[PDB]
RNA sequence: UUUGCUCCACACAAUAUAGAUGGAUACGAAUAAGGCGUCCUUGUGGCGUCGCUGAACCAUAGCAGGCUAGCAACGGUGCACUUGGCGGAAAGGCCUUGGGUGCUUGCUGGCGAAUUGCAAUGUCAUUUUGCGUGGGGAUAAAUCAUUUGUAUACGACUUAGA
RNA sequence: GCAGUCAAGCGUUCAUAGCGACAUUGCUUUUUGAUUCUUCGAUGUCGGCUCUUCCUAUCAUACCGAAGCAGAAUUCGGUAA
RNA sequence: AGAACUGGCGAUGCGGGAUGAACCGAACGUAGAGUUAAGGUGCCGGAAUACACGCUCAUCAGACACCACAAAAGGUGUUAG
RNA sequence: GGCCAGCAUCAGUUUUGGUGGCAGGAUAAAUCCAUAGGAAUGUAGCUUGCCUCGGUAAGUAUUAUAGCCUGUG
């Protein structure tokens, strides 16, 4: 029930996340996925490196240019999977992909704004404890993606500043928590507890 | 069949003090300190009374249980390592050409340098791992001794030296030339 | 220095546990475990609120942080006197969980006129609080 | 097949002038209804005696309710069944509150572990084991130990909303 | 090339909308673990407490929100000024010192609304340009045609010329 | 045509390092048969020259394992086009 | 390639088997409302990321009749006997 | 009397809820109460390695300062 939804894509499974995002877009809902390089995939690394090499060998024989494109960045590996689940050659399907924005890391506009999670795609709950999985930053790098260590440092910059903002908010919420406790005494506090609030 | 619960007992001596949060197993003792990440394994450590700790598995399959017995041993060996320490001894074997081994410096890293293995010009370097301490044994001919806290380091550092000296394109049944691990032991005596 | 191992403390399923039912004909009423069958199913028996004695699947019930003494496989007559002996109803009712349950039930049942009163009172409390934030 | 019940069936050929008053044979069937229960009877009387539904008659078809519906027992179920190759015999070991429930698990289990269908199985004899230490199997025996406690690690929470604002914990 | 060009005020006109109608309400990590408070010996520390969904929290009374008569506070927030900070991943925003100014349902009063006739979204958003009002600001290039050959099928390219 | 399985005889002693008969279970469409679905108001019917690309059932070239591998010289098998 | 009985396509659209003469469902004047068949209910795509007991992890997993293939022979992989 | 609506009482087809009275079965089976026997996943009690101000101890014991099962009413 919000005009933009920002989904911190970390600890998620590509396909299970990808299925909910596609349906939301089609129904009219602006979505923006951040932090794509922390995503996960069921099954061990070596399996999933070999699935990407199977995609690479497919190309238009008479002229490689016109044939299928292989994007290596994790934002665009997630985009592919999501473009699969939308009727993208119609005008309705374009408009749905126009409501979407994917990003490696968390750039300026979106890092002072609340982020949410999709629990039905969240791999901590869905996978059985013991099964193997693949991190989508690691995989991208192994098929040539040359901005892992740039995103690894930029994220470390904002984690520090975000940790500094929270120390001032958490200290301020203690004062507000102490005030609501002491105010909870006079008849105005007792009448709301009867009335429910 | 899924076992309702299985558990083993890590028996701690009097000297050391083993700390565990999440699954990061610190073990401080007389020889030094050792650490180990176990967050890959899925078990619950539980203290009872200082000199005994229980490891447990609940609703575990067959393979899940097996690992539970492994985690006991790795944690046992940190305890025996930091108290007693590990010591591997290796020997050189040859017929015609004697193997010349020597520790050499290179950007403050320390390498074991094997020279004249079987009449070869190629010099063979083996980098010395962090913690392990190599010394060539006096009054025992063609012997070398490695020693330290970790087994995982010492044994690997020995096996590296063992694997640097292989004979290619000959009959190894005949050409039995090399540097072989003779005795695995502890540093301290008694136990 | 001592060892200092952590714990991973848990709510167990055993004889004498008290539980809250998620979904069913009972749904939201307290019950107590009598005897276990296997990993997934157990035998409950809540003698008081209005829940038959039944084998129930652990997917359809939630465990509380409370246990009372009970012999294995005790009959409803024994469990009824044991529950009243345990003094568990007032102990459940005194806790935060049950208070939070009792609140969202009270917020549901709230006539349009009262929701106004609430607004007239919270505006009135707001003023007394924000002066305290202004002072210190 | 379905949520089972237990029935009693009795039948006795048809009567004749040369031989009035035949013999009365009886069985205990597990089925979802009476119509399947009558059919199973005539299936099992054809495997033994020289009779069929044309020559025969049913005398009384009676439901058998459970004797102690809320008491935990240890059943020992024999069973005969067809594989793809041959046709074998077994002894599984089940623990439940009623006989009809033990039969409801046994059919579900033989389907998982062996790919044996309803058609390919004969329940020979379900027998309640009165005494303890008359349990050959291991996976029932674990639960028979004294002062039995066990946790439930890794709790999950089925949500109504698609998005969530907190980030969940798997504590219990 | 008939007072052209540009940014800022308000005045009228057009032409649209993949679709406002209280608030996108900011740690990070773990999940066989943690959050929030507190006390020390600041640690992988002791003690307390929470979860079992945001069913939350914040805002929410006046003609689509009027005109006035008071009380208690020295709070609560908009509107244009103003002092100082931080933000380069796509920063285009965020905090902040000091006045000015409107309101204040934090509490008590005095007026007004009818007739849109028993319902008819009953119109209150935000893009892109035009056109005149009146206050600042700034005073060039490119192509053809001629010319070079580090270039050249033609175009293109590379040079020179008040 | 290519591959297993069982292993007769061999390989001075010795079934299985390696040669490997006959049986029994398959894959291939680079052979030839069998058939006649498409084309008889026409799809240019051998080979060579020229030139790109693909397959691996790998002759060589890289790293390995076995040997009835002292060395040299070989033989068998694995990853790999 | 040639026969026996029945049902069909030919002469026949409509829903299902992605696609298809013959398979499954069902056979058609023109409209409204209800209900189902065969088939289905993560997203494409209208409809349960339903409930329940189990099995399986694969450095070629497996995924719905007709149908678009796989065998002998092996495996202290794991599960029931 | 033309264009378009809203609200009532009615009829035909239908869809989705709340709710009363009866019948059947082992005249439900259970639970629950009156009752005879029985025992191990053994309560109190008793006795022994006993021993960190008292619990453990591994035997006995058939309800006692837990209880449980089976027949019959
Ligand atoms: Mg022809
Ligand atoms: Mg033609
Ligand atoms: Mg041609
Ligand atoms: Mg190959
Ligand atoms: Mg014809
Ligand atoms: Mg037809
Ligand atoms: Mg098909
Ligand atoms: Mg048919
Ligand atoms: Mg849908």
UniProtKB/Swiss-Prot annotation, chain A:
PROSITE patterns: RIBOSOMAL_L13. Belongs to the universal ribosomal protein uL13 family. NCBIfam families: L13_A_E. Keywords: Acetylation, Cytoplasm, Isopeptide bond, Ribonucleoprotein, Ribosomal protein, Ubl conjugation. It comes from the Eukaryota. N-terminally acetylated by acetyltransferase NatA. PANTHER family: LARGE RIBOSOMAL SUBUNIT PROTEIN UL13 (PTHR11545:SF3), RIBOSOMAL PROTEIN L13 (PTHR11545). It comes from Saccharomyces cerevisiae (strain ATCC 204508 / S288c). It is found in: Cytoplasm. HAMAP family: Ribosomal_uL13. This is Large ribosomal subunit protein uL13A. GO terms for biological process: cytoplasmic translation; maturation of LSU-rRNA; negative regulation of translation. Component of the large ribosomal subunit (LSU). Mature yeast ribosomes consist of a small (40S) and a large (60S) subunit. The 40S small subunit contains 1 molecule of ribosomal RNA (18S rRNA) and 33 different proteins (encoded by 57 genes). The large 60S subunit contains 3 rRNA molecules (25S, 5.8S and 5S rRNA) and 46 different proteins (encoded by 81 genes). The keyword RNA-binding does not apply. Its main location: cytoplasm. InterPro entries: Ribosomal_uL13, Ribosomal_uL13_CS, Ribosomal_uL13_euk/arc, Ribosomal_uL13_sf. GO terms for cellular component: cytosol; cytosolic large ribosomal subunit; nucleolus; ribosome. Pfam families: Ribosomal_L13. There is a cross-link at residue 175 (Glycyl lysine isopeptide (Lys-Gly) (interchain with G-Cter in ubiquitin)). GO terms for molecular function: mRNA binding; RNA binding; structural constituent of ribosome. Present with 43300 molecules/cell in log phase SD medium.
UniProtKB/Swiss-Prot annotation, chain B:
SUPFAM superfamilies: Ribosomal protein L6. Pfam families: Ribosomal_L6 (PF00347). GO terms for cellular component: cytosol; cytosolic large ribosomal subunit. Keywords: Cytoplasm, Ribonucleoprotein, Ribosomal protein. Component of the large ribosomal subunit (LSU). Mature yeast ribosomes consist of a small (40S) and a large (60S) subunit. The 40S small subunit contains 1 molecule of ribosomal RNA (18S rRNA) and 33 different proteins (encoded by 57 genes). The large 60S subunit contains 3 rRNA molecules (25S, 5.8S and 5S rRNA) and 46 different proteins (encoded by 81 genes). uL6 lines the binding pocket for eukaryotic elongation factor 2 (eEF2). Present with 52400 molecules/cell in log phase SD medium. This is Large ribosomal subunit protein uL6A. It comes from Saccharomyces cerevisiae (strain ATCC 204508 / S288c) (Baker's yeast).
Swiss-Prot record, chain C:
Its main location: cytoplasm. Keywords: Acetylation, Cytoplasm, Ribonucleoprotein, Ribosomal protein. N-terminally acetylated by acetyltransferase NatA. InterPro entries: KOW, Rib_uL2_dom2, Ribosomal_eL14, Ribosomal_eL14_dom, Translation_prot_SH3-like_sf. It comes from the Eukaryota. It is found in: Cytoplasm. Component of the ribosome, a large ribonucleoprotein complex responsible for the synthesis of proteins in the cell. The small ribosomal subunit (SSU) binds messenger RNAs (mRNAs) and translates the encoded message by selecting cognate aminoacyl-transfer RNA (tRNA) molecules. The large subunit (LSU) contains the ribosomal catalytic site termed the peptidyl transferase center (PTC), which catalyzes the formation of peptide bonds, thereby polymerizing the amino acids delivered by tRNAs into a polypeptide chain. This is Large ribosomal subunit protein eL14A. The lineage of its organism: Eukaryota, Fungi, Dikarya, Ascomycota, Saccharomycotina.
UniProtKB/Swiss-Prot annotation, chain D:
Its main location: cytoplasm. The keyword Chloroplast does not apply. The modification Phosphoserine is found at residue 32. GO terms for biological process: cytoplasmic translation. It holds the Pfam family Ribosomal_L18A. GO terms for molecular function: structural constituent of ribosome. GO terms for cellular component: cytosol; cytosolic large ribosomal subunit. It comes from the Eukaryota. There is a cross-link at residues 125, 131, 149 (Glycyl lysine isopeptide (Lys-Gly) (interchain with G-Cter in ubiquitin)). InterPro entries: Ribosomal_eL20, Ribosomal_eL20_dom, Ribosomal_eL20_eukaryotes. Keywords: Cytoplasm, Isopeptide bond, Phosphoprotein, Ribonucleoprotein, Ribosomal protein, Ubl conjugation. Gene3D superfamilies: 3.10.20.10. It is found in: Cytoplasm. The keyword Translocase does not apply. Belongs to the eukaryotic ribosomal protein eL20 family. PANTHER family: 60S RIBOSOMAL PROTEIN L18A (PTHR10052). Present with 54300 molecules/cell in log phase SD medium. There are 2 genes for eL20 in yeast. Component of the ribosome, a large ribonucleoprotein complex responsible for the synthesis of proteins in the cell. The small ribosomal subunit (SSU) binds messenger RNAs (mRNAs) and translates the encoded message by selecting cognate aminoacyl-transfer RNA (tRNA) molecules. The large subunit (LSU) contains the ribosomal catalytic site termed the peptidyl transferase center (PTC), which catalyzes the formation of peptide bonds, thereby polymerizing the amino acids delivered by tRNAs into a polypeptide chain. This is Large ribosomal subunit protein eL20A. The lineage of its organism: Eukaryota, Fungi, Dikarya, Ascomycota, Saccharomycotina. The gene is RPL20A.
